[PDB]
Design an enzyme around this catalytic site. Structure first.
Site, PDB file in Angstrom:
ATOM      1  N   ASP G  90       0.827  -1.198   0.000  1.00 25.88           N
ATOM      2  CA  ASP G  90       0.000   0.000   0.000  1.00 25.88           C
ATOM      3  C   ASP G  90       0.864   1.251   0.000  1.00 25.88           C
ATOM      4  O   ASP G  90       0.676   2.146  -0.832  1.00 25.88           O
ATOM      5  CB  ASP G  90      -0.913  -0.043   1.221  1.00 25.88           C
ATOM      6  N   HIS G  91       1.821   1.328   0.926  1.00 28.24           N
ATOM      7  CA  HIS G  91       2.718   2.477   0.974  1.00 28.24           C
ATOM      8  C   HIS G  91       3.507   2.607  -0.318  1.00 28.24           C
ATOM      9  O   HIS G  91       3.997   3.693  -0.643  1.00 28.24           O
ATOM     10  CB  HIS G  91       3.664   2.355   2.165  1.00 28.24           C
ATOM     11  N   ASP G  92       3.663   1.508  -1.052  1.00 27.43           N
ATOM     12  CA  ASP G  92       4.223   1.600  -2.395  1.00 27.43           C
ATOM     13  C   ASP G  92       3.257   2.318  -3.327  1.00 27.43           C
ATOM     14  O   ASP G  92       3.642   3.261  -4.026  1.00 27.43           O
ATOM     15  CB  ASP G  92       4.538   0.193  -2.913  1.00 27.43           C
TER      16      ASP G  92
END
Ligand SMILES: *[C@@H]1O[C@H](CO[C@@H]2O[C@@H](C)[C@@H](O)[C@@H](O)[C@@H]2O)[C@@H](O[C@@H]2O[C@H](CO)[C@@H](O[C@@H]3O[C@H](CO[C@H]4O[C@H](CO)[C@@H](O)[C@H](O)[C@@H]4O)[C@@H](O)[C@H](O[C@H]4O[C@H](CO)[C@@H](O)[C@H](O)[C@@H]4O)[C@@H]3O)[C@H](O)[C@H]2NC(C)=O)[C@H](O)[C@H]1NC(C)=O
Ligand SMILES: *[C@@H]1O[C@H](CO[C@@H]2O[C@@H](C)[C@@H](O)[C@@H](O)[C@@H]2O)[C@@H](O[C@@H]2O[C@H](CO)[C@@H](O[C@@H]3O[C@H](CO[C@H]4O[C@H](CO)[C@@H](O)[C@H](O)[C@@H]4O)[C@@H](O)[C@H](O)[C@@H]3O)[C@H](O)[C@H]2NC(C)=O)[C@H](O)[C@H]1NC(C)=O
Ligand code: HEM
Ligand code: HEM
Ligand SMILES: CC(=O)N[C@@H]1[C@@H](O)[C@H](O)[C@@H](CO)O[C@H]1O
Ligand SMILES: CC(=O)N[C@@H]1[C@@H](O)[C@H](O)[C@@H](CO)O[C@H]1O
Ligand SMILES: CC(=O)N[C@@H]1[C@@H](O)[C@H](O)[C@@H](CO)O[C@H]1O
Ligand SMILES: *[C@@H]1O[C@H](CO)[C@@H](O)[C@H](O)[C@H]1NC(C)=O
Lengths: 457, 100, 79, 96, 52, 457, 100
Positions: G90-92
């Site tokens: 997600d943070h990607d």
């Protein structure tokens, strides 16, 4: 080339413009967000994306209020206070800082017409259509007031507006589109009405504003006027199209709109062929008197498509689910023409760079149609979205009663033309097909008239 | 909701601004600009579109669309009213403003 | 017994309509009847052979299923 | 009156949406018994066997008619002809 | 098959739903390429050439 | 209540916040166009919308350049210059005006870590994963330098970055997504790779940032750490989650990242059930130390969905082709639960008003999956768009040679975990599936290592 | 055209800005705001959504999501690395900024 100017560069050995330093005027469209480093540039649609007869009632509150005759309680529309067409209504005049209608002929001193659209004074034909619609609205309002004397001006205006919009929708979707797409595309892209989706997006697509320019290939190089006997009306029966651009004085001081409508009914259109795309009248002498130099309509279309950042021909072919050519032979097979394919390949260098408008007008016409498969697909998709996504569609339940719908289903454009004008001989049904006199012209007394008895309350 | 509005607002209950006036177009495909966001093809000389130089629109109209006007042919199954109603419907549908 | 004529023209028309055929010539009904007769002859011959090997006088559905399967025409819903 | 090709399209839409058998059961059973009379005499048929034969025959005929329609469309035609059936059977390897 | 029945606005599963599920999936159609499903009908498909 | 603040109101009889005048802090997202009346509001994506290991190398040129080891020519990543994890690299420290990591423990005075994302120090587990990825990149760069001594620093950096991105893509699309969507949704929405389709839009949808929050339902209310024998490591074998938020000092000063990874690998997650959605730690004690009052993660998700103007549950059900409930009975049938449907109907009043997050997490889970059909549809569509619309996909021809692809196909998460970390016992394949010790743990001496012999020049 | 770009530009040759950073999201469905373009539901009291009042998010989170922690059910088929890798990916993928 400083913004917001994007002039058209002049190639060498140009037949018309000998000077290379000159350029064709061109202005970029207004961005949705003026100044941005994040949002992709998008354009602005200044009119309602519905078939609601916005050409006569406008699209903004101030202009619409100014267009109404707020002097009585009859709910009418403002008409010209200085000129009349044999005792019939005319479009009201407009006040502008710069008026091309006065520039066209300084002797007559006839300003441009004021209507729901700012372009309603390009040619006498558009003014004739707008005046016809205004007269129809006025007649409907008067008949409703006579039938319902207890109503007020606002109610009569709203009812007449609803009826006019319904008539426009009926005429369009019953006569125009079947002759554009053809029966196969009409059945594929515009099936029978089922109900009202509220989940269909009714916004106008960016590509459509180009894909709908195919009518520029149907332009005849002359404007024709006919007298009562459908004979060439003198003087100047066939007038050049370069002398009618923004020339409103040809309406007030040249016998009114009846000869223009008669010539409109009894003149064949220009057929679109792969070796005959657009006439030279609009290609080399567009707005010759208004502007410093004439413009180029196909070149303007291509430059506008480039400005909007529309994808190429192959991208739109893939969007519509059609085969995408890549070489000379594939393009020739798709177009059923090798010389045109060779010319396009030489000019552009790859089918992916062919403009949407040029690719659409280069495709062969459908069976009993007027557009190619790509243009037909785009137009059908857009109009189906407009029809299904419209809450106030006439066929939608709760908008019109069963009796009202039954009465409205019997309307016809020749009936409107004969009732609102002095024309006594009108073409048969499907006016967009009958073009020969007196092969398919009737006496106009046989066509049924719209029954307003179902509107009594 | 007895009658239509004049600006197209609230025609769609869920999204009142959908289909109204003075609103941005809907993009069926992502935009294809020279620099990516806000520059057309041909704005900067020397740039190429997908590995090929951008052709001049006037040149394209000159070498393809042009044809002698005496070879024009009429349509035996249509009339000029077809074109006129096409224009009227188009002016009903959309209009893209540009700065003065 | 000419029961091959029991497959009527409207039946063949319905079968063609299910297949997407719009227009039908009047000379194809005999061809369809012949094709159906050949297919039925082959399948029924195989089924009767299967029945005869089992020393039975009743052609069960399983024999027909096996006869269809051995010709690469596997049928689902009868065993 | 309806122009030719409309009722045909309606029938195409209707019969492609239903699942019922399109051949009368009794004539098909009689034909099956007549054909089986050649290989053996005094044979008894279960109802399931006749039903399976009918389903297989109908499916085979529908597939053959689809291939025949493709063959006819290839030759720039709308009307099914026996030569299309023969070509489809020859290509599929049945009469080859 | 259950998804097909749900989209057809029905509760139970019938051979028509099984045929619809099989014929609408590429891998499943390839697996059951020479298989006939009883009371399954056919997939709706009309050639565009014959269209009016 | 003034822009950009969008505070959350407090209902009467709130179990936690007795006072009603208080509010939960909340800030509206930055619009794409700062102030307009023509364009609908849109949000900003500050990261590259690709699976390219952007967590470590950043998404902006200044940050990416600041994250490297420019002091040498070996093409490594910058590591912490003050602390080490038993002789192993740690994330570099960061300088912020209002550092939240200092507020958690005033005595330790350990600032937040610096990586390619600003939220790398929320909990020690994310920091451990980031440190593991950085260690893997450094090790790969060192191995490549040893294998090819003639390469420069930039080439080594780019090659290691490509290998890390390919490893992340392989791990994700081979282990994580099948365990989320389930086999049916995985096969329906993610079929076999064919080639690079340049017409696929690779952008991130707005609803995805709300559809992917389902992982908030898998959070356990504790943080578990295990010693070298996978026994509860003392002191504090289980730490409450409310005390580990923004606590980077638990990484540097509490033995490193070995126990955190061990606890991650050998601890069951929290099952999502229709009567147990989210724990009370993330619902009532989120960021308790940092701010005045704790937050509400489900309420924050729902209010963020409201801020973005996402449509309701029914509209998204119609978008994915699923049937749309309209009444309480239909909603109960769809959710396979009547009490939950009744509660939802009482709270909202109609299924059209149900927020996307609550509707997605209320649906029953797929077979062998962890999301409902609607969330599965959205996530599968987004990830198929990401894979197909990416030019540098690891399976795309030209990105890697056949030998490189064969070597990369054998990578796995346990090998990376036990290659750059003191862990000697790791789970079997599919790390996300095995959670019991010592039932499915291997000695790390049986998993083959990545072979770089195909990278020789 | 050998390695990726840090900004993410030039990944798509036709539209170089597609999939880049600091760019607007793509809308699969038209937005549904309170007034139509720039107002969230519940911003002003007394305005209802689709003919029904807008429920306070905290209220529904209280009456639906809340459950006693004692009855937590461990997942016997998954581990915590499931959630951790989900958050990392997600943070990607995405990050929506907010003003400070
Ligand atoms: C490369 O990828 C392209 C994009 O692929 C999409 O994204 C990936 C992730 C997958 O999900 C994939 O399935 C997606 O399509 C792909 O091009 C795509 O090709 C399809 C099929 O040709 C195109 O669909 C056609 O579009 C129009 C209208 O459809 C919708 O358009 C409007 C626009 O908003 C929507 O509002 C409506 O929902 C419309 O439904 C039609 O031309 C057509 O419908 C007709 O199709 C045939 C006509 O012969 C008939 O059989 C049908 O019954 C219909 O009458 C299709 O729906 C799609 O637009 C197109 N996308 C793009 C972005 O161009 C391409 O094929 C891929 N290339 C390869 C080699 O795989
Ligand atoms: C009212 O109409 C809507 C919309 O119908 C569209 O417009 C009309 C005018 C026609 O042209 C239709 O063909 C158009 O679809 C209907 O709802 C639609 O239902 C379909 C079928 O269930 C939905 O399509 C699904 O979408 C999913 C795939 O996502 C697609 O989009 C993404 C992002 O753009 C992209 O990956 C790609 O384009 C995908 O194709 C998927 O679940 C599934 O495969 C299927 O294709 C469609 O999304 C719905 N549209 C909307 C706007 O929600 C209604 O059925 C109709 N109502 C009635 C009562 O008839
Ligand atoms: C008959 C004589 C016509 C003339 C003199 C004319 C002239 C013009 C001109 C000069 C433009 C501006 C183009 C630009 O700014 O790029 C325009 C716009 C347009 N024309 Fe025509 N036109 C005619 C007929 C038609 C017809 C019949 C149609 C459709 C059936 C049509 C479709 C359009 C469309 C869609 C636009 C939209 C351009 C925009 O919104 O920016 N035109 N017209
Ligand atoms: C495990 C502990 C986690 C914590 C404490 C946490 C905390 C948070 C918080 C406070 C936000 C801000 C939301 C807002 O302000 O609206 C957020 C954003 C988000 N979280 Fe989580 N999260 C965790 C795990 C996860 C997981 C595992 C996933 C998905 C699998 C996830 C998905 C998201 C998404 C999509 C966002 C929105 C991103 C954005 O708005 O830019 N989170 N997280
Ligand atoms: C009152 C009446 O019978 N006709 C009027 C006309 O005189 C006036 O010029 C027009 C525009 O205002 O409105 C109408
Ligand atoms: C050369 C030319 O077009 N002259 C016309 C003239 O015929 C007309 O009488 C006058 C007023 O309408 O406008 C001008
Ligand atoms: C309550 C708390 O967090 N106390 C910590 C303590 O555990 C740690 O040993 C010390 C030095 O790191 O910092 C403080
Ligand atoms: C990073 O740079 C410093 C510069 O002093 C160097 O000592 C260190 O070894 C470098 N990092 C690695 C992992 O080699």
């Amino acid at each position: 080339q400083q913004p917001p100017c994007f002039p058209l560069k002049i190639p060498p050995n140009d037949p018309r413009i000998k000077n290379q330093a000159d350029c064709i005027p061109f202005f970029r469209s207004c961005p949705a967000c003026p100044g941005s480093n994040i949002t992709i540039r998008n354009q602005i649609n200044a009119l309602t994306s519905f078939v609601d007869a916005s050409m006569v009632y406008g699209s903004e509150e101030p202009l619409a209020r100014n267009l109404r005759n707020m002097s009585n309680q009859l709910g009418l529309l403002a008409v010209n206070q200085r000129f009349q067409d044999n005792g019939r209504a005319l479009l009201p005049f407009d006040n502008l800082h710069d008026d091309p209608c006065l520039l066209t002929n300084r002797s007559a001193r006839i300003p441009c017409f004021l209507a729901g659209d700012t372009r309603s004074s390009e040619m006498p034909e558009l003014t004739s259509m707008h005046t016809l619609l205004l007269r129809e609205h006025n007649r409907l309002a008067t008949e409703l007031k006579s039938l319902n004397p207890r109503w007020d001006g606002e109610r009569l205006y709203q009812e007449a507006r609803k009826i006019v919009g319904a008539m426009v929708q009926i005429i369009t979707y019953r006569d125009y589109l079947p002759l554009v797409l053809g029966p196969t595309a009409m059945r594929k892209y515009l099936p029978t009405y089922r109900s009202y989706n509220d989940s269909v997006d009714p916004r106008i697509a960016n590509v459509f504003t180009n894909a709908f320019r195919y009518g520029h290939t149907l332009i005849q190089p002359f404007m024709f006027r006919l007298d009562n006997r459908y004979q060439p009306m003198e003087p100047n029966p066939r007038v050049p199209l370069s002398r009618v651009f923004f020339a409103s004085w040809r309406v007030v001081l040249e016998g009114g709109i009846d000869p223009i409508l008669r010539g409109l009914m009894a003149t064949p259109a220009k057929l679109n062929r792969q070796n005959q795309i657009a006439v030279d009248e609009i290609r080399e002498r567009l707005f010759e008197q208004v502007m410093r130099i004439g413009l180029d309509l196909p070149a303007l279309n291509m430059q506008r498509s480039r400005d909007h950042g529309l994808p190429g021909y192959n991208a739109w072919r893939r969007f519509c689910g059609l085969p995408q050519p890549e070489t000379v032979g594939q393009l020739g097979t798709v177009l059923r023409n090798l010389k045109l394919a060779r010319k396009l390949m030489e000019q552009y260098g790859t089918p992916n760079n062919i403009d949407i408008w040029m690719g659409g007008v280069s495709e062969p016409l459908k069976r009993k149609g007027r557009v190619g498969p790509l243009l037909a697909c785009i137009i059908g998709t857009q109009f189906r979205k407009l029809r299904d996504g419209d809450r106030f569609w006439w066929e939608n339940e709760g908008v019109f009663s069963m009796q009202q719908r039954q009465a409205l289903a019997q309307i016809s454009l020749p009936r409107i033309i004969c009732d609102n004008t002095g024309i006594t001989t009108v073409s048969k049904n499907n006016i967009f097909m009958s073009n020969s006199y007196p092969r398919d012209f009737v006496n106009c007394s046989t066509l049924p008239a719209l029954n307003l008895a179902s509107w009594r309350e | 909701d007895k009658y239509r509005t004049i600006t197209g607002m609230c025609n769609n209950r869920r999204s009142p601004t959908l289909g109204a006036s003075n609103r941005a177009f809907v993009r069926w495909l992502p935009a294809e600009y020279e620099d990516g966001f806000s520059l057309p093809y041909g704005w900067t000389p020397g740039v190429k579109r997908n590995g090929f130089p951008v052709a001049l629109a006037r040149a394209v109209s000159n070498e393809i669309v042009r044809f002698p006007t005496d070879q024009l042919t009429p349509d035996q199954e249509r009339s000029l009213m077809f074109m006129q109603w096409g224009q009227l419907l188009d002016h009903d549908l959309d209009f893209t403003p540009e700065p003065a | 017994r000419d029961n091959i004529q029991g497959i009527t023209k409207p039946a063949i028309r319905r079968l063609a309509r299910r297949g997407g055929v719009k227009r039908i010539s009047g000379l194809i009904y005999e061809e369809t009847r012949g094709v159906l007769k050949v297919f039925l002859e082959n399948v029924i011959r195989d089924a009767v052979t299967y029945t005869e090997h089992a020393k039975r006088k009743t052609v069960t559905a399983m024999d027909v299923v096996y006869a269809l399967k051995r010709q690469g025409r596997t049928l689902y819903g009868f065993g | 009156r309806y122009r030719p090709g409309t009722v045909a399209l309606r029938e195409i839409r209707r019969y492609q949406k239903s699942t019922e058998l399109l051949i009368r059961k009794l004539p098909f059973q009689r034909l099956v018994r007549e054909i089986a009379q050649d290989f053996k005499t005094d044979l008894r048929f279960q109802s399931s066997a006749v039903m399976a034969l009918q389903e297989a025959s109908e499916a085979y005929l529908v597939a053959l008619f689809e291939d025949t329609n493709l063959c006819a469309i290839h030759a720039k035609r709308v009307t099914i002809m026996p030569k299309d059936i023969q070509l489809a059977r020859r290509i599929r390897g049945e009469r080859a | 098959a259950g998804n097909a029945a749900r989209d057809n606005k029905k509760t139970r599963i019938i051979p028509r739903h099984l045929q619809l599920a099989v014929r609408n999936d590429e891998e499943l159609n390839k697996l059951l390429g020479r298989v006939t499903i009883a009371q399954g009908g056919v997939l709706p498909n009309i050639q565009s050439v014959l269209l009016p």
